[PDB]
Design a protein around this ligand. Structure first.
Ligand code: HEM
Length: 153
């Protein structure tokens, strides 16, 4: 439930993500996996990566890092009109990957952090404002969707 103003903000800030998607993304996931060792077990793909280095050295993680941030990017552009984009990802993240709504909070926090370390001084307060809001409005809907399939509650 954001406005144009805050949307513009989400789009502009995102414009920084675009310039280097695999970069932002590698790190997004690397933070997640490091700060929450438990998330990495849901990936038969990266369960092996013990070290953070072994994580940086891996191009597999870069690649997914891309899928991740491009689909997300795809949704933000919809400006809340993302029912179409969200669902498939809700069901898939729910019934198949079995991703607890809290894992979506972890990563949501992953982004916001990454945006800073990566852009220290150009990720203004109103931008952070805007960035939290859409990740929220996005968490919200998955959750609405997750209550449906009755996954964790
Ligand atoms: C903005 C949040 C996320 C987005 C947009 C996203 C997007 C995607 C997409 C597009 C796929 C491939 C197609 C599909 O299976 O539907 C996928 C697969 C997957 N998702 Fe995510 N994802 C997100 C966060 C997470 C999180 C936090 C976890 C759990 C730690 C997770 C677990 C997985 C796994 C394990 C796969 C498949 C692994 C494999 O390829 O073997 N996702 N995700």
């Amino acid at each position: 439930g954001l406005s144009d103003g805050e949307w513009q903000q989400v789009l502009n800030v995102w414009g920084k993500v675009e310039a280097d998607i695999a970069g932002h993304g590698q790190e997004v996931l690397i933070r997640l996996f490091t700060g929450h060792p438990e998330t990495l077990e849901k990936f038969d793909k990266f369960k092996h990566l013990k070290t953070e280095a072994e994580m940086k050295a891996s191009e597999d993680l870069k690649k997914y890092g891309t899928v991740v941030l491009t689909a997300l990017g795809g949704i933000l552009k919809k400006k809340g009109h993302h029912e179409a984009e969200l669902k498939p990802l809700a069901q898939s993240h729910a019934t198949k990957h079995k991703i607890p709504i809290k894992y979506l909070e972890f990563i949501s926090d992953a982004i916001i952090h990454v945006l800073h370390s990566k852009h220290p001084g150009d990720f203004g307060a109103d931008a952070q404002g805007a960035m939290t809001k859409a990740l929220e409005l996005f968490r919200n809907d998955i959750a609405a969707k997750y209550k449906e399939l009755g996954f964790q509650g």
